[PDB]
Amino acid sequence: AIERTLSIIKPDGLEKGVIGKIISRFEEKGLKPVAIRLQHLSQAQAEGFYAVHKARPFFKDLVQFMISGPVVLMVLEGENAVLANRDIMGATNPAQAAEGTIRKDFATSIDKNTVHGSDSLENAKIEIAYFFRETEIHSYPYQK
Amino acid sequence: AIERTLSIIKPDGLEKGVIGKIISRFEEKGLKPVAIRLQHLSQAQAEGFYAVHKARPFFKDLVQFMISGPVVLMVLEGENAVLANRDIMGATNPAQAAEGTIRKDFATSIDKNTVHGSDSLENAKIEIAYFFRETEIHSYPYQ
Amino acid sequence: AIERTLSIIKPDGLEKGVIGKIISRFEEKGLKPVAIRLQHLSQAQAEGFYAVHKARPFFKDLVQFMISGPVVLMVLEGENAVLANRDIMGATNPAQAAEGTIRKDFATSIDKNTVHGSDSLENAKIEIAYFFRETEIHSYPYQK
Amino acid sequence: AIERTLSIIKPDGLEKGVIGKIISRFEEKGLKPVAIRLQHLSQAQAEGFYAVHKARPFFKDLVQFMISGPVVLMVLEGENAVLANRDIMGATNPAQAAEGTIRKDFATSIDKNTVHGSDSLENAKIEIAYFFRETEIHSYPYQ
C-alpha cells in the first residue's frame, strides 16, 4: 500500500549542509518527496507537535533543540513508506544505528539525531495534517 | 559578497528523482538553501513569473512545461550566488553544458532543462519576492 | 460541542465588497473565524475540492465560477458550528433564502450564491484539511 | 494614485469580535483587501517586523502584545492607501482619536490600539514583502 509519512530534517542536518544527501537517501530507496518546506518552528509549534510526549523527561530539551534553527519539513510517499522511512533513518541512538542509515552517517548524538519520522500510519496522518494542507502535497510520476 | 538568488527545480528534475543530487550540488559549492518549498504552479503563476519573456517565442511552451507537474522553489544564499548558481546550472542547451554542471548531468533538452536560476541580482529580488515572504527565508550557520 | 467548519466567500462576495459584512454575520452569531486566507483557486484546486460532485451537471460551471476571481477561505469555530453556519448562509437559492441570511441579503443567483459552507461534520474535517494546516488555525478568547 | 499598504488587526480586535466591522470600514472607504491571512506571530517574527522601533521604549511591550494572540494580516489596495488607511485608523492614542475612526470605536488603550498601518509607501513595500509573497496578493474588480 502506497502511504505518506512525515519526515523532518532537524536543525543539525541543515547546519552540516547535508539536506541534499538526506533527501537522496529517501529518493534512492523509492520514498518520493511529495511535500517539502523549510521552516523555523516556534516553541508553540514544536510543543503542539510533540504534545503526546509532554510528560517525558526529554520533552523540554527536545523542544528547545527543534526551535534552535530551521528544519526541513517533508512528506514522503511510497509503498510501506512509514516503515521504510524508519528503516532508512536507523535507530534513534546513532551508536546503535545500522550501517548505511541517516543517523549512522550523519547524526551527532541521541539528542541531535538529524531526522524525525512518523512512528505509525495513525500518527503520520496527524503529523502531516499538522504541517501541510492537502493542497501542498503533490504526487508526480518517476520517469527517466 | 553574499547574495540570495532564486533556484527552481523544474518538473523533470523531480520526475528523475534527483532533487537531493541537485540540492547537494549547491550545498557542496557553498550555496546555502535558505528557503525551500515544493509547489505545483498554476498557469497564472507561471505566466506572471516569466512575464519578462512574454514576447519571446518559447514563452507558451515554457509555461506549459512549468505547470506540467510540481516544482521545488528555493532561495540560495552565498558568495556571488547569482553568478555562482548560474555557473553550476550550466548552459541552457544541455548539448553544450560544461562537465559537472546540473544540466549536463540531468537535463534532457533545451526545453526541459531541469533548473532555473535568476539571471541578475535585480531580477533575483523580484523572483524571490514573487514566491517567498521574507518570513519564509531563514539563514543558519554551517558547522 | 465546539466544532470547526469551512466557510468560503465566493468570488461574487469580494466583487460586491462585502467581505466584512459577511464575516460580521458569523461573528455576531458566535461563529469565531479561527483561520482566514484570501486565495485565488486554480482549476486543479477547485476540482479536487468538489470532486465528490464531478458527476453532477453543475460541476463544470461551478469550477469555472470558483476560479474566476479570488475567494476568502475561513474556518469558523463554535457550538454546533456546522449547522449554525448553514443557518446563517441560508438556502442555496437566494429567492428561497430566509430573512437575514447571507444569501438572501447578498447572493445574486443560485449559481452566484456568495458563500460555501461544509454540509456535515464529516465533510468539514476534509474541507478544512484540504485548505489549512492545523498550524494555520488559531482559537482565541472572546473578551471586551 | 493606487497604492498598497499593510494593515494588521491586532490581538484585541479579534478578541472583541470586530474583524468584520474593521474590514467593512476599509471596504466602504474604497480600500480593497487584496490579501488576508490570520496568523499567530512568533517573537522573532514580531521583533523582525518592528525592527525600526528596536531602540524605542515601547518595543518590548509592543512585541509581547503582538504575540499574545493571533492577528489578521491584510494588504489594502486603493487610491492614496497609505495615508487613507492611517486616517481611518485614527490617532495612536484612542483618547484623542477622531470620531468614526477604528481606534476611537474599538481601541482600549495606546498599547492595545486594535490596528497597525504602514506609515509610509517605502515602509509599506517592506512590511508587505515581510508577510506576503506577491503570489498571495490578488486584485479583483468591484461590481
Coordinates of C-alpha atoms in Angstrom, one line a residue:
Chain A
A1 CA 0.0 0.0 0.0
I2 CA 1.2 3.5 -1.0
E3 CA 1.4 5.5 2.2
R4 CA 2.5 9.0 3.1
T5 CA 4.7 9.7 6.2
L6 CA 6.2 12.8 7.7
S7 CA 10.0 13.4 7.7
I8 CA 11.7 16.3 9.3
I9 CA 15.4 17.2 8.8
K10 CA 16.3 18.5 12.3
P11 CA 18.5 21.7 12.8
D12 CA 21.8 19.8 12.9
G13 CA 21.1 18.4 9.4
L14 CA 21.0 21.9 7.9
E15 CA 24.0 23.1 9.9
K16 CA 26.0 20.1 8.5
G17 CA 24.8 21.1 5.0
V18 CA 23.5 17.6 4.2
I19 CA 19.9 18.4 3.2
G20 CA 20.6 17.0 -0.3
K21 CA 22.3 13.9 0.9
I22 CA 19.4 13.1 3.2
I23 CA 16.8 13.6 0.5
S24 CA 18.9 11.4 -1.8
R25 CA 18.7 8.6 0.8
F26 CA 15.0 8.6 0.5
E27 CA 14.8 9.1 -3.3
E28 CA 17.2 6.2 -3.9
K29 CA 15.0 4.0 -1.7
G30 CA 11.8 4.8 -3.5
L31 CA 10.5 7.3 -1.0
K32 CA 9.2 10.1 -3.1
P33 CA 9.2 13.6 -1.5
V34 CA 5.7 15.0 -2.4
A35 CA 5.8 18.0 0.0
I36 CA 8.8 20.0 1.2
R37 CA 9.0 23.2 3.2
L38 CA 11.9 24.8 5.0
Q39 CA 10.5 26.5 8.2
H40 CA 11.7 27.7 11.5
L41 CA 9.4 26.3 14.2
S42 CA 8.1 28.4 17.0
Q43 CA 8.0 27.0 20.6
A44 CA 4.2 26.7 20.3
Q45 CA 4.6 24.7 17.1
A46 CA 7.2 22.3 18.5
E47 CA 5.2 21.7 21.7
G48 CA 2.0 21.2 19.9
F49 CA 3.8 18.7 17.6
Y50 CA 5.3 16.7 20.4
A51 CA 2.3 17.1 22.8
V52 CA 1.7 13.4 23.4
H53 CA 5.2 13.3 25.0
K54 CA 4.8 16.3 27.2
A55 CA 5.2 14.1 30.3
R56 CA 8.5 12.6 29.2
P57 CA 11.7 14.0 30.8
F58 CA 13.2 14.7 27.4
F59 CA 10.3 17.0 26.3
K60 CA 11.8 20.4 27.2
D61 CA 15.2 19.7 25.7
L62 CA 13.6 18.3 22.6
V63 CA 11.5 21.4 22.1
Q64 CA 14.5 23.7 22.5
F65 CA 16.6 21.9 20.0
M66 CA 13.8 21.7 17.5
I67 CA 13.4 25.5 17.6
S68 CA 17.1 26.3 17.7
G69 CA 17.3 26.6 13.9
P70 CA 15.2 26.0 10.8
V71 CA 14.2 22.5 9.8
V72 CA 13.1 21.0 6.5
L73 CA 9.5 19.5 6.6
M74 CA 8.7 16.7 4.2
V75 CA 6.0 14.2 3.3
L76 CA 7.4 11.0 1.8
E77 CA 5.3 8.8 -0.4
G78 CA 5.8 5.1 -1.2
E79 CA 4.9 1.5 -0.6
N80 CA 5.1 0.9 3.2
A81 CA 6.6 4.4 3.4
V82 CA 6.1 4.7 7.2
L83 CA 8.2 1.6 8.0
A84 CA 10.6 2.1 5.1
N85 CA 11.2 5.7 6.4
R86 CA 12.1 4.3 9.9
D87 CA 14.5 1.7 8.3
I88 CA 16.3 4.4 6.4
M89 CA 16.6 6.7 9.4
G90 CA 18.0 4.0 11.6
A91 CA 18.0 3.6 15.4
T92 CA 17.4 6.8 17.5
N93 CA 20.8 6.3 19.0
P94 CA 23.5 6.8 16.3
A95 CA 25.9 4.4 18.0
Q96 CA 23.2 1.8 17.8
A97 CA 22.2 2.7 14.3
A98 CA 22.7 0.2 11.4
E99 CA 25.1 0.6 8.5
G100 CA 24.0 2.9 5.7
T101 CA 21.3 4.7 7.7
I102 CA 20.9 8.5 8.0
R103 CA 21.5 8.6 11.7
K104 CA 24.6 6.3 11.5
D105 CA 26.1 8.5 8.8
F106 CA 25.0 12.0 9.9
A107 CA 23.7 12.1 13.5
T108 CA 25.8 13.6 16.3
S109 CA 24.0 12.1 19.4
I110 CA 20.7 10.7 20.6
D111 CA 19.7 14.3 21.2
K112 CA 20.9 15.6 17.9
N113 CA 19.9 12.7 15.7
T114 CA 19.3 14.6 12.4
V115 CA 15.8 13.3 11.3
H116 CA 12.3 12.7 12.6
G117 CA 9.9 10.2 11.1
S118 CA 6.3 9.3 11.9
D119 CA 6.2 6.2 14.1
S120 CA 3.0 4.8 12.7
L121 CA 0.3 5.3 10.0
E122 CA -2.0 6.7 12.7
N123 CA 0.5 9.3 13.7
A124 CA 1.6 10.0 10.1
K125 CA -1.9 11.3 9.3
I126 CA -1.8 13.7 12.3
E127 CA 1.8 14.9 11.8
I128 CA 1.2 15.6 8.1
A129 CA -2.1 17.4 8.7
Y130 CA -0.3 19.5 11.3
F131 CA 2.3 20.9 8.9
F132 CA 0.6 20.6 5.4
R133 CA -2.7 21.4 3.7
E134 CA -3.7 18.6 1.3
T135 CA -3.2 21.3 -1.4
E136 CA 0.5 21.5 -0.5
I137 CA 1.2 17.8 -1.3
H138 CA 1.7 16.8 -4.9
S139 CA 2.5 13.4 -6.2
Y140 CA 4.2 13.0 -9.6
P141 CA 5.5 10.2 -11.7
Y142 CA 9.0 8.9 -11.6
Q143 CA 10.3 8.6 -15.2
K144 CA 13.8 9.0 -16.8
Chain B
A1 CA 29.6 39.5 -1.4
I2 CA 26.8 37.3 0.0
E3 CA 23.7 37.4 -2.2
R4 CA 20.4 35.5 -2.4
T5 CA 19.1 34.1 -5.7
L6 CA 16.1 32.0 -6.8
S7 CA 16.6 28.4 -7.9
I8 CA 13.7 26.3 -9.2
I9 CA 14.0 22.6 -9.8
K10 CA 11.8 22.1 -12.9
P11 CA 9.3 19.2 -13.3
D12 CA 11.8 16.9 -14.9
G13 CA 14.2 17.1 -12.0
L14 CA 11.5 15.7 -9.7
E15 CA 10.5 13.1 -12.2
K16 CA 14.1 11.9 -12.5
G17 CA 14.3 11.6 -8.7
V18 CA 17.4 13.8 -8.3
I19 CA 16.1 16.6 -6.0
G20 CA 18.7 15.6 -3.5
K21 CA 21.6 15.4 -6.0
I22 CA 20.7 18.9 -7.2
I23 CA 20.5 20.4 -3.7
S24 CA 23.8 18.7 -2.8
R25 CA 25.4 20.3 -5.9
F26 CA 24.6 23.7 -4.4
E27 CA 25.5 22.9 -0.8
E28 CA 28.8 21.4 -1.7
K29 CA 29.7 24.7 -3.6
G30 CA 28.8 27.0 -0.7
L31 CA 25.3 27.9 -1.9
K32 CA 23.1 27.6 1.2
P33 CA 19.4 26.7 0.7
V34 CA 17.7 29.2 3.0
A35 CA 14.1 28.7 1.7
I36 CA 12.6 25.6 0.1
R37 CA 9.0 24.8 -1.0
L38 CA 7.6 22.1 -3.3
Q39 CA 4.7 23.6 -5.2
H40 CA 2.6 23.0 -8.3
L41 CA 2.3 26.2 -10.2
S42 CA -0.9 27.4 -11.9
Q43 CA -0.8 28.9 -15.4
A44 CA -1.3 32.4 -14.0
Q45 CA 1.6 31.9 -11.6
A46 CA 3.9 30.7 -14.3
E47 CA 2.9 33.4 -16.7
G48 CA 3.4 36.1 -14.1
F49 CA 6.7 34.7 -13.2
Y50 CA 8.0 34.7 -16.7
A51 CA 6.4 38.0 -17.7
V52 CA 9.7 39.4 -18.9
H53 CA 9.7 36.6 -21.6
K54 CA 6.1 37.3 -22.7
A55 CA 7.2 38.3 -26.2
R56 CA 9.7 35.5 -26.7
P57 CA 8.8 32.6 -28.9
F58 CA 9.5 29.9 -26.2
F59 CA 7.1 31.5 -23.7
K60 CA 4.0 29.4 -24.3
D61 CA 6.0 26.2 -24.2
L62 CA 7.9 27.2 -21.1
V63 CA 4.7 28.0 -19.3
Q64 CA 3.1 24.6 -20.2
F65 CA 6.2 22.7 -19.2
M66 CA 6.5 24.6 -15.9
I67 CA 2.9 23.7 -14.9
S68 CA 3.0 20.1 -16.2
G69 CA 4.0 18.9 -12.7
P70 CA 5.2 20.2 -9.3
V71 CA 8.5 22.1 -8.9
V72 CA 10.8 22.8 -6.0
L73 CA 11.3 26.5 -5.3
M74 CA 14.5 27.5 -3.5
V75 CA 16.4 30.6 -2.3
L76 CA 20.1 30.1 -2.3
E77 CA 22.4 32.3 -0.2
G78 CA 26.1 32.6 -0.7
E79 CA 29.1 34.5 -2.0
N80 CA 28.3 35.7 -5.5
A81 CA 25.2 33.5 -5.5
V82 CA 23.5 34.9 -8.7
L83 CA 26.5 34.1 -10.9
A84 CA 27.7 31.0 -8.9
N85 CA 24.2 29.4 -9.2
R86 CA 24.1 30.0 -13.0
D87 CA 27.6 28.5 -13.4
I88 CA 26.6 25.4 -11.5
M89 CA 23.5 25.0 -13.6
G90 CA 25.4 25.1 -16.9
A91 CA 24.4 26.3 -20.4
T92 CA 20.7 26.4 -21.2
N93 CA 21.3 24.0 -24.0
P94 CA 22.4 20.7 -22.3
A95 CA 24.3 19.8 -25.6
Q96 CA 26.8 22.5 -24.8
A97 CA 26.7 22.5 -21.0
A98 CA 30.0 22.1 -19.1
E99 CA 31.1 18.9 -17.4
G100 CA 29.9 18.6 -13.8
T101 CA 27.0 21.1 -14.3
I102 CA 23.5 20.2 -13.4
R103 CA 22.2 20.5 -16.9
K104 CA 24.9 18.4 -18.5
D105 CA 24.2 15.6 -15.9
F106 CA 20.4 15.8 -15.7
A107 CA 18.9 17.9 -18.5
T108 CA 17.4 16.1 -21.5
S109 CA 16.7 19.0 -23.8
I110 CA 16.8 22.8 -24.0
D111 CA 13.1 23.0 -23.2
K112 CA 13.3 20.5 -20.3
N113 CA 16.5 21.7 -18.7
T114 CA 15.9 20.8 -15.1
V115 CA 16.7 24.1 -13.3
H116 CA 16.0 27.8 -13.4
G117 CA 18.3 30.4 -11.8
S118 CA 17.8 34.2 -11.5
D119 CA 19.8 35.8 -14.2
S120 CA 20.7 39.0 -12.3
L121 CA 20.6 40.4 -8.7
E122 CA 17.7 42.8 -9.6
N123 CA 15.7 40.1 -11.1
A124 CA 16.6 37.8 -8.2
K125 CA 15.0 40.2 -5.7
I126 CA 11.8 40.2 -7.8
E127 CA 11.7 36.4 -8.3
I128 CA 12.3 35.8 -4.6
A129 CA 9.5 38.2 -3.5
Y130 CA 7.2 36.5 -6.1
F131 CA 7.4 33.1 -4.3
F132 CA 8.6 33.8 -0.8
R133 CA 7.6 36.0 2.2
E134 CA 10.7 37.3 4.0
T135 CA 9.4 35.3 7.0
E136 CA 9.8 32.1 4.9
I137 CA 13.5 32.7 4.3
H138 CA 15.9 31.5 7.1
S139 CA 19.6 31.8 7.2
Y140 CA 21.5 29.5 9.6
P141 CA 25.2 28.9 10.3
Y142 CA 27.2 26.0 9.0
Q143 CA 29.1 23.8 11.4
Chain C
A1 CA -20.0 20.6 21.1
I2 CA -17.5 23.2 19.8
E3 CA -16.9 22.3 16.1
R4 CA -15.0 23.7 13.2
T5 CA -16.4 24.2 9.8
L6 CA -15.2 25.6 6.5
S7 CA -16.6 28.8 5.0
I8 CA -15.7 30.2 1.7
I9 CA -16.7 33.6 0.5
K10 CA -17.1 33.1 -3.3
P11 CA -15.9 35.5 -6.0
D12 CA -19.1 37.5 -6.1
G13 CA -18.8 38.3 -2.4
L14 CA -15.4 40.0 -3.0
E15 CA -16.6 41.8 -6.1
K16 CA -19.5 43.3 -4.1
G17 CA -17.1 44.4 -1.4
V18 CA -19.0 42.7 1.4
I19 CA -16.2 40.6 3.0
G20 CA -16.5 42.5 6.2
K21 CA -20.3 42.3 6.3
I22 CA -20.2 38.5 5.8
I23 CA -17.6 38.0 8.5
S24 CA -19.7 40.2 10.8
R25 CA -22.7 37.9 10.2
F26 CA -20.7 35.0 11.6
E27 CA -19.1 36.9 14.4
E28 CA -22.4 38.3 15.7
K29 CA -23.8 34.8 15.8
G30 CA -20.9 33.4 17.8
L31 CA -19.1 31.7 14.9
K32 CA -15.5 32.7 15.5
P33 CA -13.1 32.9 12.5
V34 CA -10.1 31.0 13.6
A35 CA -8.4 30.7 10.1
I36 CA -8.7 33.1 7.2
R37 CA -6.8 33.3 3.9
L38 CA -7.6 35.2 0.7
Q39 CA -6.6 32.9 -2.2
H40 CA -7.2 32.6 -5.9
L41 CA -8.0 28.9 -6.6
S42 CA -6.6 27.0 -9.5
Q43 CA -8.8 24.7 -11.6
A44 CA -7.0 21.7 -10.1
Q45 CA -7.8 23.0 -6.6
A46 CA -11.5 23.7 -7.3
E47 CA -11.9 20.3 -9.0
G48 CA -10.2 18.5 -6.2
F49 CA -12.3 20.3 -3.7
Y50 CA -15.6 19.5 -5.4
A51 CA -14.5 16.0 -6.6
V52 CA -17.4 14.1 -5.0
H53 CA -19.7 16.1 -7.3
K54 CA -17.8 15.5 -10.5
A55 CA -20.8 13.5 -11.9
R56 CA -23.3 16.4 -11.4
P57 CA -24.3 18.6 -14.3
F58 CA -23.4 21.7 -12.4
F59 CA -19.8 20.6 -11.8
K60 CA -18.1 22.4 -14.7
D61 CA -19.8 25.7 -14.3
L62 CA -19.2 25.6 -10.5
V63 CA -15.5 25.1 -11.1
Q64 CA -15.2 27.9 -13.6
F65 CA -17.0 30.4 -11.3
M66 CA -14.9 29.3 -8.3
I67 CA -11.7 30.2 -10.2
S68 CA -13.0 33.3 -11.9
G69 CA -11.7 35.5 -9.1
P70 CA -10.1 35.2 -5.6
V71 CA -12.1 33.8 -2.7
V72 CA -11.7 34.1 1.1
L73 CA -11.2 30.8 2.9
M74 CA -12.2 30.5 6.5
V75 CA -12.6 28.1 9.4
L76 CA -15.4 29.0 11.8
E77 CA -15.4 27.7 15.3
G78 CA -18.4 27.5 17.7
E79 CA -21.0 25.3 19.3
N80 CA -22.8 23.3 16.5
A81 CA -20.8 25.5 14.1
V82 CA -21.5 23.2 11.1
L83 CA -25.3 23.6 11.4
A84 CA -25.2 27.2 12.6
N85 CA -23.1 28.1 9.6
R86 CA -25.7 26.6 7.2
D87 CA -28.5 28.5 9.0
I88 CA -26.6 31.8 8.6
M89 CA -25.9 31.2 4.9
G90 CA -29.5 30.4 4.1
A91 CA -31.0 28.3 1.3
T92 CA -28.8 27.7 -1.8
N93 CA -31.4 29.5 -3.8
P94 CA -31.4 33.2 -2.7
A95 CA -35.1 33.6 -3.7
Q96 CA -35.9 30.7 -1.3
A97 CA -33.5 32.0 1.4
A98 CA -34.8 33.1 4.8
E99 CA -34.8 36.6 6.1
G100 CA -31.5 37.9 7.5
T101 CA -29.3 35.2 5.9
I102 CA -26.2 35.9 3.8
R103 CA -27.6 34.5 0.6
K104 CA -30.9 36.4 1.0
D105 CA -29.1 39.7 1.5
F106 CA -26.0 39.3 -0.8
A107 CA -26.4 36.5 -3.3
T108 CA -27.2 37.1 -7.0
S109 CA -28.4 33.7 -8.1
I110 CA -28.3 30.0 -7.3
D111 CA -25.1 30.0 -9.4
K112 CA -23.6 33.1 -7.8
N113 CA -24.7 32.4 -4.2
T114 CA -21.8 34.2 -2.3
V115 CA -20.8 31.6 0.3
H116 CA -19.9 27.9 0.7
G117 CA -20.2 26.0 4.0
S118 CA -19.4 22.4 4.9
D119 CA -22.5 20.3 4.7
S120 CA -21.6 18.0 7.6
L121 CA -19.0 17.4 10.3
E122 CA -17.6 14.5 8.2
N123 CA -17.0 16.8 5.3
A124 CA -15.9 19.8 7.4
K125 CA -12.9 17.7 8.5
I126 CA -11.9 17.0 4.9
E127 CA -12.6 20.6 3.5
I128 CA -10.6 22.2 6.4
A129 CA -7.6 19.8 5.9
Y130 CA -7.7 20.5 2.2
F131 CA -7.1 24.2 2.7
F132 CA -5.4 24.6 6.0
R133 CA -2.6 23.0 8.1
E134 CA -3.5 22.6 11.7
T135 CA -0.8 25.2 12.4
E136 CA -2.8 27.8 10.4
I137 CA -5.9 27.6 12.7
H138 CA -5.8 29.6 15.9
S139 CA -8.5 29.9 18.5
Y140 CA -8.6 32.9 20.8
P141 CA -10.8 34.1 23.6
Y142 CA -13.7 36.5 23.1
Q143 CA -13.4 39.3 25.7
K144 CA -14.4 43.0 25.7
Chain D
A1 CA -2.6 57.1 -7.2
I2 CA -3.4 53.5 -6.4
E3 CA -1.1 52.1 -3.6
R4 CA -0.9 49.0 -1.5
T5 CA -0.3 49.2 2.2
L6 CA -0.2 46.7 5.1
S7 CA -2.9 46.6 7.7
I8 CA -2.8 44.3 10.8
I9 CA -5.8 43.7 13.1
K10 CA -4.1 43.4 16.4
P11 CA -5.0 40.7 19.0
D12 CA -7.6 42.8 20.7
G13 CA -9.5 43.3 17.5
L14 CA -10.1 39.6 17.2
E15 CA -10.9 39.2 20.9
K16 CA -13.6 41.9 20.6
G17 CA -15.1 40.0 17.6
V18 CA -14.9 43.0 15.3
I19 CA -12.8 41.6 12.4
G20 CA -15.7 42.2 10.0
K21 CA -16.5 45.7 11.3
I22 CA -12.9 46.7 10.7
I23 CA -12.7 45.2 7.3
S24 CA -16.0 46.9 6.3
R25 CA -14.5 50.2 7.5
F26 CA -11.9 49.8 4.8
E27 CA -14.1 48.4 2.0
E28 CA -16.7 51.2 2.5
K29 CA -14.0 53.8 2.0
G30 CA -12.5 52.3 -1.1
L31 CA -9.6 50.4 0.4
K32 CA -9.8 46.9 -1.2
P33 CA -8.5 43.9 0.8
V34 CA -6.3 42.2 -1.8
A35 CA -4.5 39.8 0.7
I36 CA -5.7 38.4 4.1
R37 CA -4.3 35.9 6.4
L38 CA -5.0 35.1 10.1
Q39 CA -1.7 34.2 11.8
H40 CA -0.1 33.9 15.2
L41 CA 3.2 35.6 15.2
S42 CA 6.3 34.2 17.0
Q43 CA 8.5 36.6 18.9
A44 CA 11.2 36.5 16.2
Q45 CA 8.5 37.5 13.6
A46 CA 7.3 40.4 15.7
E47 CA 10.8 41.6 16.6
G48 CA 11.8 41.5 12.9
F49 CA 8.7 43.3 11.8
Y50 CA 9.1 46.1 14.3
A51 CA 12.9 46.3 13.8
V52 CA 12.8 50.0 13.1
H53 CA 11.4 50.5 16.7
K54 CA 14.1 48.4 18.4
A55 CA 15.5 51.4 20.3
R56 CA 12.2 52.8 21.3
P57 CA 10.9 52.3 24.9
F58 CA 7.6 50.7 23.9
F59 CA 9.3 48.0 21.8
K60 CA 9.4 45.1 24.3
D61 CA 5.7 45.7 25.2
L62 CA 4.6 46.0 21.6
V63 CA 6.3 42.7 20.8
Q64 CA 4.6 40.9 23.8
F65 CA 1.2 42.3 22.9
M66 CA 1.6 41.4 19.2
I67 CA 2.4 37.7 20.1
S68 CA -0.2 37.4 22.9
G69 CA -2.7 36.0 20.4
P70 CA -3.4 35.7 16.6
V71 CA -3.7 38.7 14.3
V72 CA -5.2 39.3 10.9
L73 CA -2.6 40.4 8.3
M74 CA -4.0 42.4 5.3
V75 CA -2.9 44.2 2.2
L76 CA -5.2 47.1 1.3
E77 CA -5.2 48.5 -2.2
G78 CA -6.7 51.8 -3.2
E79 CA -6.2 55.5 -4.0
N80 CA -3.7 57.0 -1.6
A81 CA -4.0 53.9 0.5
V82 CA -1.0 54.5 2.8
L83 CA -2.5 57.8 4.1
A84 CA -6.1 56.8 3.7
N85 CA -5.6 53.7 5.9
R86 CA -3.9 55.8 8.6
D87 CA -6.7 58.3 8.6
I88 CA -9.4 55.6 9.0
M89 CA -7.3 54.0 11.8
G90 CA -7.2 57.3 13.8
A91 CA -4.7 58.6 16.3
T92 CA -2.4 56.1 18.1
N93 CA -3.8 57.3 21.4
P94 CA -7.6 56.3 21.4
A95 CA -8.2 59.2 23.8
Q96 CA -7.6 61.7 21.0
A97 CA -8.7 59.6 18.1
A98 CA -11.3 61.2 15.7
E99 CA -14.9 60.2 15.6
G100 CA -15.7 57.3 13.3
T101 CA -12.1 56.1 13.3
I102 CA -11.3 52.4 14.1
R103 CA -9.3 53.3 17.2
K104 CA -11.9 55.6 18.7
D105 CA -14.6 53.0 18.2
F106 CA -12.6 49.9 19.2
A107 CA -9.2 50.7 20.8
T108 CA -9.0 50.4 24.6
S109 CA -5.6 52.0 25.2
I110 CA -2.5 53.3 23.4
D111 CA -0.7 49.9 23.8
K112 CA -3.7 47.9 22.7
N113 CA -4.9 50.0 19.8
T114 CA -6.5 47.4 17.6
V115 CA -4.8 48.1 14.3
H116 CA -1.4 48.8 12.6
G117 CA -1.0 50.5 9.2
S118 CA 2.2 51.1 7.3
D119 CA 3.4 54.7 8.0
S120 CA 4.9 55.4 4.5
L121 CA 5.0 53.9 1.0
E122 CA 8.6 52.8 1.4
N123 CA 7.9 51.0 4.6
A124 CA 4.7 49.6 3.1
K125 CA 6.6 47.8 0.5
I126 CA 8.9 46.3 3.1
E127 CA 6.1 45.3 5.5
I128 CA 4.1 43.7 2.7
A129 CA 7.0 41.7 1.5
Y130 CA 7.7 40.6 5.1
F131 CA 4.3 38.8 5.3
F132 CA 3.2 38.2 1.8
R133 CA 4.5 36.5 -1.4
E134 CA 3.4 38.5 -4.5
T135 CA 1.5 35.4 -5.4
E136 CA -0.6 35.7 -2.3
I137 CA -1.9 39.2 -3.3
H138 CA -4.8 39.3 -5.6
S139 CA -6.6 42.3 -7.1
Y140 CA -10.1 41.9 -8.4
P141 CA -12.6 44.4 -9.8
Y142 CA -15.6 45.8 -7.9
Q143 CA -19.1 45.4 -9.3

